Subunit: 323 residues, 3 copies
């Protein structure tokens, strides 16, 4: 195929982060997504690719927990500082930056790096708000706290963690919209309500339908002006029947069609600037078909964010051959 509806320049970074949580196996998410044919699929869409490979993270030897709860803070903070450098570089060179996870604490680095695009906005697709502060978290898992480090308005509620001094809150509460929420901790509900952070929970999707959810999301984020979009997509936003290979599955999620629709609409803006595809943990699948299904779904989301659609039309056909 020589003709395509659009030609995107895409950078791919593997970020096998696992220290943002306790379940082993999420470090294998990048290799699982790659094995599901990610690079071939993007090439088939006419993308110009730059593969940065899979990043290497050496854990800090004396990484003592913060306030007897926050686990691996120097390792998470430091690995995110290195990831932020790679993202800033890829975006600076003109690539839409795809980061494969790895747990969701990697968004601290991808969003910080990307903003180095200060007017970026974030579409956070997840069953979870990931907005616990280091003081509200009950698990001490940093994948449940990334948004707290990034939002300007929450700065006074967030203590300075070891290995996190480099972070400057980059997004305002009006510049992030959540889609898919269904497992929100009481302090997170408090934060979303009191800081007027807009979200479309599963109940909002049940009422509005995904078409109106995307229209409203774009009105909130890019209604006033064109802005680079950061799509942070947790695989657990999808129903566990569709995405079983993940750490914190919650029943009643997005259908395959709703998830593709989100990605298709993001592509249709022509503003996608960085994408995170996180929390694929092949080890938590009960079977190879369950693991492959989850990895295939991750590839479908990424492909749809760069032009794959249900009707085709991504690949341009010149003329029909005559007998």
């Amino acid at each position: 195929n020589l003709y395509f509806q659009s030609v995107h320049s895409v950078a791919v970074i593997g970020a096998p982060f696992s220290q943002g949580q306790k379940r082993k196996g999420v470090e294998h998410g990048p290799a699982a997504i790659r094995e599901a044919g990610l690079m071939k699929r993007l090439s088939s869409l006419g993308c110009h690719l730059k593969d940065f490979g899979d990043l290497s993270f050496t854990p800090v030897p004396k990484d003592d927990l913060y306030n007897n709860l926050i686990v691996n803070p120097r390792s998470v903070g430091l690995a995110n500082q290195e990831l932020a450098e790679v993202v800033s570089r890829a975006v600076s060179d003109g690539y839409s930056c795809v980061t494969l996870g790895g747990d969701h604490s990697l968004a601290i680095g991808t969003i910080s790096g990307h903003a180095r695009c200060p007017d970026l906005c974030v579409v956070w697709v997840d069953a979870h708000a990931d907005i616990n502060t280091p003081l509200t978290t009950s698990s001490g898992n940093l994948h449940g706290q990334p948004v707290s480090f990034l939002l300007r308005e929450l700065q006074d509620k967030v203590p300075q963690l070891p290995g996190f001094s480099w972070i400057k809150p980059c997004i305002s509460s009006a510049s992030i919209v959540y889609i898919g929420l269904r497992d929100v901790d009481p302090p997170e509900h408090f934060i979303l309500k009191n800081y007027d952070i807009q979200y479309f929970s599963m109940r909002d999707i049940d009422r509005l339908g995904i078409q109106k959810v995307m229209e409203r999301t774009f009105d909130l984020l890019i209604g006033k002006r064109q802005r680079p979009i950061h799509l942070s997509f947790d695989i657990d936003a999808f129903d566990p029947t569709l995405a079983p290979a993940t750490g914190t599955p919650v029943v009643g999620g997005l259908t395959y069609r709703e998830g593709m629709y989100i990605a298709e609409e993001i592509h249709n803006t022509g503003l996608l600037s960085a994408l995170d595809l996180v929390e694929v943990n092949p080890q938590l699948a009960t079977s190879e078909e369950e693991a492959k299904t989850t990895a295939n779904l991750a590839v479908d989301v990424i492909a749809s964010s760069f032009g794959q659609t249900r009707e085709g039309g991504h690949i341009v056909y010149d003329q029909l051959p005559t007998p």
Copy 2:
């Protein structure tokens, strides 16, 4: 904060498949009381009722199955429900087959003259003892409760105590997909409002709930009796049930119904019926059905998809 009473009704004589009597045990083992406690409910457990058996109770008019046993168990259940409601509790009854709504609705109506009913089921359960083809009383409970059908209903043995207590405009069905021709005639003829799966496909569950409440509580506040048959859900989500019908409610739709019922602040009684764990092909399928039953009950008392049940007042500061 809600005052919630729980009654186990291990009864199976409203139908022919054995095992539905284990439904209350399955729901309790799925952690019902712990979940309601975690939502701040002031609870009262009445336990699992031991229904007085009727030894001689064979086929009536070569059609009606166990009329004496169904009539008696429902009379006994009506007494326990009446006790819970008069004591100020929102009454949760765990089934057991759906013939048990004869008892729960009769018991509730003894204290609520203006009660209304939301009947969530794949079936209308409105055959009269003359229209029924199976003779199974779980397919007939609404016929004994509806005032407008009194002249169409014969007096069955053990059913003399029942007083029709609901009018045709006071019951709304949600989830219908397997309706008998006489049931269809009854619904249309008597102007009984229903939202079948086809109506949900067209309108969406949000409009279905808005219209349901407009019909029932649009003019005035009334106590709500939610009669919820687990088979309203798609059999892939609720396989452990006697009469599964494909193309049912999704998990999201069922939670939405329960959340909207909670939001009225008028839920007065809830029945969670037809969970038959013995009909599941595996243990996990039985447990999935029981877990779904708990989610319906918890959502009916405040459990949400947005984390607003436990109120946080101040975030800790560094």
Copy 3:
């Protein structure tokens, strides 16, 4: 009262996967006849047609597999279909692969030139013999039937009998999700209207049906040909099929399409294709697909999810 002719067309040569020839029997074993009878249909079963096997049938231009075999079997089928239509029967052809639509549509158009087609499938089946990569004729049936496409279709051995009968404005697709680049080109350049899965996600199935009928029968009433590929449904619902594609129609959406088709009173012929019981991983997976095939056909002839199929106008009195 609907007069319905059931034809078993055990086609398999339109594709490479074996087992799809056992599709008509799998649908019968799923109780198709018992179901259509219960709906008050006047039935004629032609049984399974025995097509003349072509021993010497080499590939056309080193790509098109079994051309003569597919072309001849469709010629025989078009005659049986033309005769069943002539006799006053609504023709239900059981598949078999989707290349059989060449035969069913051709036969139907001989007596119904103003027919319109509702093609329900994950695929547009509109590759020409020159655009196909697989050489499988089930991916090309619509190219041989479309009037506006005649100059781009070469004459294949055993395909000369086919006269392009359907125009581009007389076919509407529903369910599309796996469309090859030359197929997208064809749909867009020949103005063929379609409702992909993305259009369904936006509009909802009720609006999709309203718009489908607006396009086809907005100006006048016309005979309807419903060509239904079982793969239109999500593979979780219809796994026993050759080319499954994730994110398809739900059970509810598929029933709604069939109900709307029934509601026009204009249904003249129906194809139920691509059920392959051999591709199922278990016995229940094959049975599920066959049961789904029966529900589609039954709903196209009156089966409802509200029980309004049978005339009932008087309640029995005690």
